[PDB]
Amino acid sequence: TRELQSLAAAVVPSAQTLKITDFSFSDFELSDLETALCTIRMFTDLNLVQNFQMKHEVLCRWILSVKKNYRKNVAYHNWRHAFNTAQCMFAALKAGKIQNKLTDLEILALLIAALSHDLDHRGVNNSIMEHHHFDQCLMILNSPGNQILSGLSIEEYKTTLKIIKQAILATDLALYIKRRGEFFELIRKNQFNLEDPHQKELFLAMLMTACDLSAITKPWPIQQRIAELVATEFFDQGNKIPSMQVGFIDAICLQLYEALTHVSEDCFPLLDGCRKNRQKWQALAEQ
Numbered sequence: 001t002r003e004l005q006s007l008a009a010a011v012v013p014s015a016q017t018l019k020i021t022d023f024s025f026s027d028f029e030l031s032d033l034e035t036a037l038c039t040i041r042m043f044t045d046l047n048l049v050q051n052f053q054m055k056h057e058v059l060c061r062w063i064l065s066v067k068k069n070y071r072k073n074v075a076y077h078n079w080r081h082a083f084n085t086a087q088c089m090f091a092a093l094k095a096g097k098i099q100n101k102l103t104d105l106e107i108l109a110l111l112i113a114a115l116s117h118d119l120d121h122r123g124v125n126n127s128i129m130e131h132h133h134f135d136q137c138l139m140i141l142n143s144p145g146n147q148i149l150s151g152l153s154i155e156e157y158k159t160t161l162k163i164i165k166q167a168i169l170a171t172d173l174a175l176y177i178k179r180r181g182e183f184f185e186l187i188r189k190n191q192f193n194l195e196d197p198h199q200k201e202l203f204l205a206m207l208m209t210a211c212d213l214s215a216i217t218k219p220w221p222i223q224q225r226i227a228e229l230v231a232t233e234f235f236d237q238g239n240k241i242p243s244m245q246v247g248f249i250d251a252i253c254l255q256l257y258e259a260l261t262h263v264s265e266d267c268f269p270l271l272d273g274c275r276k277n278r279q280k281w282q283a284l285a286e287q
């Protein structure tokens with residue numbers, strides 16, 4: 001309440017000041033309070049506070065509830081990773097122009113899922129995990145004073161919960177591998193149509209994984225620092241790195257970001273930064 005009083009009374013700087021529209025956004029210089037302000041700006045500039053009548057104090061308490069339920073002692077899967085996944089979601093809807101291809105409920109659920117998709121993570125060394133993350137997302141969404149979705153009707157609320165649940169479930173890389181071949185086959189044949197609800201639901205799953213791994217697309221000095229955090233989680237429980245990074249980019253990332261650019265050409269900076277990082281890690285791999 002000492003933190004919530006200061007956050008609620010603050011002024012929320014514009015999206016341009018906060019630099020949350022650039023795919024190259026980084027958070028290393030930001031306080032926990034600054035990340036909260038950037039998050040309010042995301043809800044605000046996506047018209048989520050307005051279209052769904054969110055009381056300011058409730059959104060402030062909800063953001064702080066979400067942030068508190070991430071574990072700081074976890075090197076990578078912490079609040080900062082969830083904040084970044086939401087930022088890339090914002091950058092994709094705005095700079096990537098994905099906004100027009102989605103509905104308000106879908107955008108409202110994507111932002112909530114991106115912020116929640118790793119709640120109570122304990123580090124890689126501890127599809128059940130994603131079901132636990134949605135469980136914690138649901139518990140916070142139902143906490144007194146945190147119900148940011150109270151402005152929705154019951155039909156709106158039930159649809160949004162279904163989308164939130166699927167989006168968090170989609171961040172299971174096993175589900176991504178199960179489903180990506182379909183998404184690539186329909187991108188191949190020039191058949192991809194978002195009007196198909198099964199195709200729209202599949203795309204929302206791919207958009208989640210794209211933002212979930214957005215770190216692999218960051219500029220080299222940032223990507224180097226994030227790859228450190230990843231190593232500290234996998235390794236030190238809190239040489240071989242360059243090769244494992246190129247293998248991850250090859251197996252997982254490059255096709256995903258390639259397909260995303262076909263859906264919207266303005267998501268190209270993700271595919272670009274992911275390639276420049278493959279070059280950098282490949283050179284390091286060769287010593």
Ligand SMILES: COc1ccc([C@H]2C[C@H]3c4c(nc5ccc(C#N)cc5c4N2)CCN3C(C)=O)cc1Cl
Pocket residue numbers: 213215216217223226227228230231232234235241244245248
């Ligand atoms: C001991 O050190 C490492 C070991 C492996 C990796 C590789 C693979 C790794 C991985 C995973 N998710 C990542 C998400 C983002 C980024 C970035 N940027 C990189 C990610 C990432 N890199 C999950 C799958 N995985 C597995 C199975 O090991 C990196 C480091 Cl440093």
Ligand SMILES: [Mg+2]
Pocket residue numbers: 117118171172
């Ligand atoms: Mg996860």
Ligand SMILES: [Zn+2]
Pocket residue numbers: 081085117118171212
């Ligand atoms: Zn994640």
